[PDB]
């Protein structure tokens with residue numbers, strides 16, 4: 001029943017992506033800055049960007065007003081270029097966890113690896129879910145098998161590309177994403193089922209208007225989420241790997257700015273596809289009634305629009321664009337997680353080149369399997385894409401601010417900030433993971449599923465409490481050990 005045309009199309013597109021990169025690696029006027037910016041854009045923009053942005057715009061509860069992850073994650077690159085690019089450079093940093101291990105120690109750096117590893121896993125699960133949904137809709141494959149196949153192909157791509165040389169694969173992949181999406185959009189807009197997306201943005205005919213709305217009581221919560229996506233999107237090894245490998249600090253800053261511009265440009269057609277899905281009379285298409293959000297297939301809105309509103313070859317171009325985005329992001333995500341585990345955890349704390357290569361291969365496999373299980377269990381792409389930066393914002397970002405800008409931080413403040421931020425984040429609950437809150441801040445309300453949500457900005461409160469606890473406990477421990485109030489024999493971490 002499945003169309004073999006789709007399988008042959010994804011095969012030929014994958015080969016077309018890899019062959020040009022192999023040729024460019026075989027071969028290899030002030031244009032390298034553009035190439036670096038395009039490569040960073042291809043690293044940043046994956047299945048999360050495209051599919052999660054379309055889902056967030058499509059879902060009536062969110063709209064464009066609540067599709068904050070594309071804008072926030074693009075602004076993360078601008079903020080990184082402005083403030084974090086120079087302090088991370090000119091030091092012997094290979095990974096993002098190197099400042100943490102150099103200032104707080106190996107154990108605290110390994111502890112800080114856990115939020116980063118969980119964020120990488122959430123991002124990989126979101127992009128695996130996006131690719132599996134695209135394959136399942138367009139090639140008509142079972143969703144579980146499609147997700148497993150996507151994870152397998154991403155794993156083999158990362159491994160095969162790793163040992164050999166790849167040059168300018170990301171440029172060609174970004175070109176494929178851009179062309180596929182921007183040729184899919186005009187075909188989707190001209191479908192007889194799709195109504196005027198300008199009218200649907202401000203008026204409701206099929207569902208609530210896709211521009212979205214923010215209530216006056218929700219404003220703080222909106223701001224809270226935006227901060228989580230704008231500041232929690234900065235401390236990632238996929239970005240700092242390109243920052244540290246640059247020739248100069250100015251080159252790193254300019255590639256950050258160009259990458260942010262490219263991310264916004266890539267986010268535009270995803271917003272348009274989500275708006276088209278929100279403006280579609282599904283009773284007129286072959287998808288039929290019920291509509292995708294009634295079917296609980298909202299997270300699959302972008303492939304559905306590609307499949308049921310576009311011709312078959314345009315659907316194949318869109319599938320190629322999604323595949324290019326997912327491969328170019330999954331390579332960086334898997335490699336960053338594996339490199340951080342191999343260098344910071346295995347090589348530095350516990351301990352050979354062959355041994356390191358082998359543990360990094362098996363780590364790629366285990367990370368892929370964990371992300372596959374997470375992708376199979378969940379039902380949302382935007383939710384995992386959002387949650388990837390949640391614990392990063394809560395935990396790593398205050399510690400990153402402390403190690404870069406706050407002179408005098410130590411391990412006691414790091415541990416205190418870790419515990420305080422984690423406690424305030426956990427006690428606030430998580431609706432995506434169906435967790436009840438223990439602390440009930442003012443404005444709490446139950447959703448459809450019965451989990452109490454928080455209108456109070458408790459995530460930003462947890463982050464700020466983590467930062468202030470780090471500073472206060474660090475200076476208090478320094479004062480207590482310097483003045484002689486606390487005996488020096490109790491300095492378990494030997495920080496001061």
Ligand SMILES: C[N+](C)(C)CCO
Pocket residue numbers: 044045046048049073123232233236385388389
């Ligand atoms: C999820 N990240 C923040 C790592 C990349 C944005 O797509």
Ligand SMILES: [Cl-]
Pocket residue numbers: 044045046047048049050329
């Ligand atoms: Cl993404």
Ligand code: NA
Pocket residue numbers: 041042043044045046047324325326327328329330
């Ligand atoms: Na990508």
